[PDB]
Every structure is written in C-alpha cells, then in structure tokens.
C-alpha cells in the first residue's frame, strides 16, 4: 500500500465589465499643498488628462 494526500484546490476565475463614460476639457491649474509633519508639495493638475 502506498498512501498520498488529496490535492490542493486550484480554481481560475474570469470576470469582466463594459462601461460608457464621458469626459471633458480642462485648463491646467496649480497650487501648493501643506500637510501634517511639515509636508510641502508643489502640485499641478491637468484637468484635461
């Protein structure tokens, strides 16, 4: 007799979705951000990207 355990399970999942979005223009803008711990950052946001 020669025993052996059962296998581990290996499952594969496949999912997916489709969406319809709309986006628009936007001029670039800037600001400076201050945060706790004396954090300071120069920020530039591209409202068109």
């Amino acid at each position: 007799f020669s025993g052996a355990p059962q296998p581990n399970q290996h499952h594969t999942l496949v999912y997916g979705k489709s969406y319809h979005f709309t986006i628009t223009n936007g001029l670039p803008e800037f600001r400076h951000l201050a945060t706790t711990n004396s954090g300071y950052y120069a920020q530039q946001r591209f409202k068109h990207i």
Binding site: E29, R31, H32, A34, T35, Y40, R45
Partner: protein
C-alpha cells in the same frame, strides 16, 4: 516662511508651451533698403513664388 497650502489657480504667470498651448506672434518683415536719395527698388516680393 509660512509654507501653507494655497488655492488652485489656472492663472500661470507664464506656463511653458511644453505643458500647454500658447499663443505666439512673430510676423516676418521684408526690408527694402533706401540708402541713396534716389534708389533702385524692386516690386514687392511675390510670396506665391
């Protein structure tokens, strides 16, 4: 001295054209020298040539 956070602004004193569309105006000028009192002058450049 007061590294505080500021408000967003599109008012870039002078943002680079490498980051956004920027208007430029550099019309070419054609000179027709008149060094003498009575000069020999050509007809206006025919730009279509």
């Amino acid at each position: 001295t007061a590294a505080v956070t500021t408000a967003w602004s599109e008012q870039f004193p002078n943002i680079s054209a490498s980051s956004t569309s920027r208007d430029i105006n550099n019309p070419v000028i054609v000179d027709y020298s008149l060094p003498y009192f009575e000069n020999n002058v050509p007809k206006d450049v025919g730009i279509y040539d």
